[PDB]
């Protein structure tokens, strides 16, 4: 059975997630409206910018993240940002319509919307496939929160300096997850492995996004539609 | 009576203005919505960003502007940008309610809205006073267009290199205005002088905005709300 420290770690992460994810998507009215060349880019940029802020809020509360150097917090935030956004978006993803449903007619997002947002099927096809794969795992709120925290504390990222302290925090959280599925998830006998494999998928997805973002960011007429935060998070500055 | 060259100059400017100013303000639905700390900043930033694009479009058509170096076009665009925006905004300014009325309940802008947008009464009080002064001149479409083109081609700006060619284009346009009021504006006996004095006002207004913008831009929580174009146009990069 799970220890107090392992339990306190779950609590703070679940509380952090609750504080940084709105299931009503009420803030979406504050973004540049969706339009249906690259008509969906303003909305997507506003949506991704908003989510980065929420990922930072969540990160600040991952036990041990606040103790890292500002440099390592930025290094990890920059390189994992898109993967956390992909992870967190599973909550709005629906198997019934193969879309991220965030509201009325306006915030129901199909894959053709992201095409009108400067991205190709080369990124979107494995993304939707990953979204369906993840949903099918019927993760507990604790597993989903832990997987985001595991993803965020991956030592193998460009820019990381203390890849021994980051690996340590990640293993401590991995032990928490592994014990949670055993003790608390019936029929979870294979889940942990399945979850770890979703992290490998995210690296491929991350890679494809980076290429597509460099293409978009290199065109001033497209980069002008992004936000200072998006520009800074996905930009190459060292 | 006015010459063909003087007439062709008026035509192209009037046509340029028509192409770059919408009297229906229909694009305003595409901006981040107005909210009533600094709730009105997203909308103002989107509004100012949109207007910069429109000022560039207008500028590109000012006879002789396209022939200047990219460096001088940028030098003039950066330093005069806010003044052109102040000039062009007079069209939406109303004496009846002392506001810029651009639409329904949402795009009716009073001075308290700009307070909620990171600016103070120190800029807004002379702005409203300038807006009322300008409106009272009951300028012809030609005078208003010419004053914007005069403003844009001011040689006395930081960064300008060919302050002899810019002074030349400006004098050529000044002669066009001076002749237009004489030949075509009854009771315009004093107007030209009154118009030239509005350019001096704009330098004070420009100065106050620059200070207030540096204060806003120095705070990352505020600069993140701006757009890449606003950031680049009002920024210090040489």
């Amino acid at each position: 059975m799970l220890s107090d420290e392992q339990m306190q770690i779950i609590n703070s992460l679940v509380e952090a997630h609750h504080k940084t994810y709105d299931d009503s998507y009420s803030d979406f009215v504050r973004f540049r409206p969706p339009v249906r060349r690259l008509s969906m880019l303003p909305h997507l940029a506003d949506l991704v910018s908003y989510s980065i802020q929420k990922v930072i809020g969540f990160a600040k509360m991952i036990p041990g993240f606040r103790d890292l150097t500002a440099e390592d917090q930025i290094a990890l935030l920059k390189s994992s940002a898109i993967e956390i956004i992909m992870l967190r978006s599973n909550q709005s993803f629906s198997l019934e319509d193969m879309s991220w449903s965030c509201g009325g007619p306006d915030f129901k997002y199909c894959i053709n919307d992201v095409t009108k947002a400067g991205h190709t099927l080369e990124l979107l096809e494995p993304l939707v496939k990953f979204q369906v794969g993840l949903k099918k795992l019927k993760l507990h709120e604790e597993e989903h929160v832990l997987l985001m925290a595991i993803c965020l504390l991956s030592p193998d990222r460009p820019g990381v300096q203390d890849h021994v302290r980051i690996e340590a925090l990640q293993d401590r959280l991995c032990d928490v997850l592994q014990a949670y599925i055993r003790i608390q998830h019936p029929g979870g006998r294979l889940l942990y492995a399945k979850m770890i494999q979703k992290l490998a998928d995210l690296r491929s997805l991350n890679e494809e996004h980076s290429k597509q973002y460099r293409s978009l960011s290199f065109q001033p007429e497209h980069s002008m539609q992004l936000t200072p935060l998006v520009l800074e998070v996905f930009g190459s500055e060292v | 009576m006015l010459s063909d060259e003087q007439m062709q100059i008026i035509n192209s400017l009037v046509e340029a203005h028509h192409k770059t100013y919408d009297d229906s303000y229909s694009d305003f639905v595409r901006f981040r919505p107005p909210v009533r700390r600094l709730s009105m900043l997203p909308h103002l930033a989107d509004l100012v960003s949109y207007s910069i694009q429109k000022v560039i479009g207008f500028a590109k058509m000012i006879p002789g502007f396209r022939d200047l170096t990219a460096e001088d076009q940028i030098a003039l665009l950066k330093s005069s940008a806010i003044e052109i925006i102040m000039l062009r905004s007079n069209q939406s300014f109303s004496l009846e309610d002392m506001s810029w009325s651009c639409g329904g309940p949402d795009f009716k802008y009073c001075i308290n809205d700009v307070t909620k947008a990171g600016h103070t009464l120190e800029l807004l009080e002379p702005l409203v006073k300038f807006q009322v002064g300008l409106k009272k001149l009951k300028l012809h479409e030609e005078e208003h267009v010419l004053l914007m083109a005069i403003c844009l081609l001011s040689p006395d700006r930081p960064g300008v290199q060919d302050h002899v060619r810019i002074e030349a284009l400006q004098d050529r346009l000044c002669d066009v205005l001076q002749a237009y009021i004489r030949i075509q504006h009854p009771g315009g006996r004093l107007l030209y002088a009154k118009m030239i004095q509005k350019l001096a006002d704009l330098r004070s207004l420009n100065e106050e905005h620059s200070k207030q913008y540096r204060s806003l831009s120095f705070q990352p929580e505020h600069s993140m709300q701006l757009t890449p174009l606003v950031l680049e146009v009002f920024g210090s990069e040489v």
């Binding site: 930072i56 500002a70 930025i74 500055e237 | 990352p220 929580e221």
Partner: peptide
């Protein structure tokens, strides 16, 4: 990384 620094307190 001005924004990222502010956001990370």
């Amino acid at each position: 990384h001005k924004i990222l620094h502010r956001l990370l307190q």
